[PDB]
Amino acid sequence: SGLVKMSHPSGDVEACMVQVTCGSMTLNGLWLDDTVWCPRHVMCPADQLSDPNYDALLISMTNHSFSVQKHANLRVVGHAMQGTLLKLTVDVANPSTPAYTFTTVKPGAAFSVLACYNGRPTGTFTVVMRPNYTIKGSFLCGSCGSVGYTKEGSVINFCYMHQMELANGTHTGSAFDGTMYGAFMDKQVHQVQLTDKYCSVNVVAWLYAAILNGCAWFVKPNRTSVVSFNEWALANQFTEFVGTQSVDMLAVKTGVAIEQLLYAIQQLYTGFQGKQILGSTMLEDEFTPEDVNMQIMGV
Amino acid sequence: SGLVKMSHPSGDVEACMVQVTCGSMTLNGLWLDDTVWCPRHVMCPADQLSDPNYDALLISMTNHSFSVQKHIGAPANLRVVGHAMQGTLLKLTVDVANPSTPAYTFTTVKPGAAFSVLACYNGRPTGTFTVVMRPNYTIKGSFLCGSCGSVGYTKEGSVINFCYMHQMELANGTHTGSAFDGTMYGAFMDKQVHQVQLTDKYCSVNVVAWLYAAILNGCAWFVKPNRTSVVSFNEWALANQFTEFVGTQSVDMLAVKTGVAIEQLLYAIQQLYTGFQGKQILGSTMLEDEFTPEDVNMQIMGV
Amino acid sequence: XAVLX
Amino acid sequence: XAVLX
Secondary structure, eight states: OOOOOOBOOOHHHHTTEEEEEETTEEEEEEEETTEEEEEGGGSSOGGGTTSOOHHHHHHTOOGGGEEEEOOOEEOEEEEEEETTEEEEEESSOOTTOOSEEEOOOOTTOEEEEEEEETTEEEEEEEEEOOTTSOBOOOOOTTOTTOEEEEEETTEEEEEEEEEEEEETTEEEEEOTTSOBTTSOOSSSSOOOOOOOOBOHHHHHHHHHHHHHTTOOTTOOSOOOOHHHHHHHHHHTTBOOOOOOHHHHHHHHHHOOOHHHHHHHHHHHHHOOTTOOBTTBSSOOOSSOHHHHHHHHSOO | OOOOOOBOOOHHHHTTEEEEEETTEEEEEEEETTEEEEEGGGGOOGGGTTSOOHHHHHHHOOGGGEEEEOOSSSOOBOOEEEEEEETTEEEEEESSOOTTOOSEEEOOOOTTOEEEEEEEETTEEEEEEEEEOOTTSOBOOOOOTTOTTOEEEEEETTEEEEEEEEEEEEETTEEEEEOTTSOBGGGOOSSSSOOOOOOOOBOHHHHHHHHHHHHHTTOOTTOOSOOOOHHHHHHHHTTTTBOOOOOOHHHHHHHHHHOOOHHHHHHHHHHHTTOOTTOOBTTBSSOOOSSOHHHHHHHHSOO | OOEEO | OOEEO
């Protein structure tokens, strides 16, 4: 296929990982310049996990309550709470802080994750933000504070800090503005998730990937317009399709129009009828148009 | 599910990548101590690609012919003071030991085994991914031109076991390269000629790993009291596009945790190979052999 | 069910 | 057919 699950090289982010302890809890933190970010649930004790009252928690804390370690040693000289995260300030500026921003990722967008335990980076994988604002990851006890990010030129865009497992193999976390993806609360009550959905734009990308590899049996002259497909999407668990220049690029290189692949989606969704594509028996929606442009073309 | 394609953190290996240039050809090299490894085809002129004489090309070279540049991380001024050929790899010697040389070994990886790849272009790390080394000694990778010299490795604690240096594209999305002993995986050769590949085969030990993961996730409808001996399975395997099953400690860990015996899953593979008959396992209609016992142990359980 | 990690 | 990368 020439399509692999590709994440960014992780060196830049490895040098920012630290361990943070408060009370009984230990987990990972992200050390950027003079601040260390970590999940605020590091504060509460075992038998309040179901309903913490984080504000009262914050008050009971001092700078001495938190211990930060690079596994130098770091002295915390300030603590603040920003939504579901702690913003700790420490007396040493991370000598290898990369150029960075904080940006919240949208459903369908991919990013790289550095899984960490006890401040030790143990591995990377890429994931797509689900239409239901969860992520299908690989996170175990000890995982929280692990970090997700994209990269643009030299700038690392931090978009995710791991927080919790909502149900078997299904995860969520906060953006660095402290908000949780989407609206989930950091307490151990049962919480209902919205129904996940196929990411239309990504499935389209994947089909263009197939065409570029000479697998084009599913292409017909028939078309479905963007507007009719979106009305169909609503009733069939697909996200609304929104075109981008990177998709447009794929359409131009292959000569196959977006709306021919919209039609093909409608048909393939009902069944592959014995055949394979690249070579699966179901639609793939975890590759973005930019993945396809990058891994297969230029670009 | 709980299972994803997980690569090693690449920071340690990022710090060894260099760009190697020779004439007009440029590609990636690996800088360990005073040696820079790279594909020998960096020597090959475009008009020699379909039939290169590497002995004659190497003769044509002096130390002056090769130059090495460090583009990322700590900058360095290198000069080659030695050049030699090791199978399909060049082995250049430079005047500066790599200050960031990690503890490491050279390991050849086996069919079924997973490794991490650091894809680079012009000495600059661009992405990482994991591949399993196919039973036909290829990998299903993601590489473009400029990517040659990109490296693959496994880790043992902090020791990095280098196993792959990217060389070529054999067909659409199917690739091979060198172990660091200079041998090409699959014995493919570094010339632009069509070279046919052996039929691929399911990696038995990984399929079993995957079935264990299913059971671990609450999916065990395929599990019967019945079993096939390893030996029985192994002779059957030779005839049905399955590699021979070699048991390991981590497989035994899965068998213990799930209470399900290996031979039972081999019997299961007999049945499933033909089709799931409308059913799914986690949640595909096909056997999956791209996860190893260590992946399942690691990502699903403690170890 | 929601499990803090 | 094989392409040197």
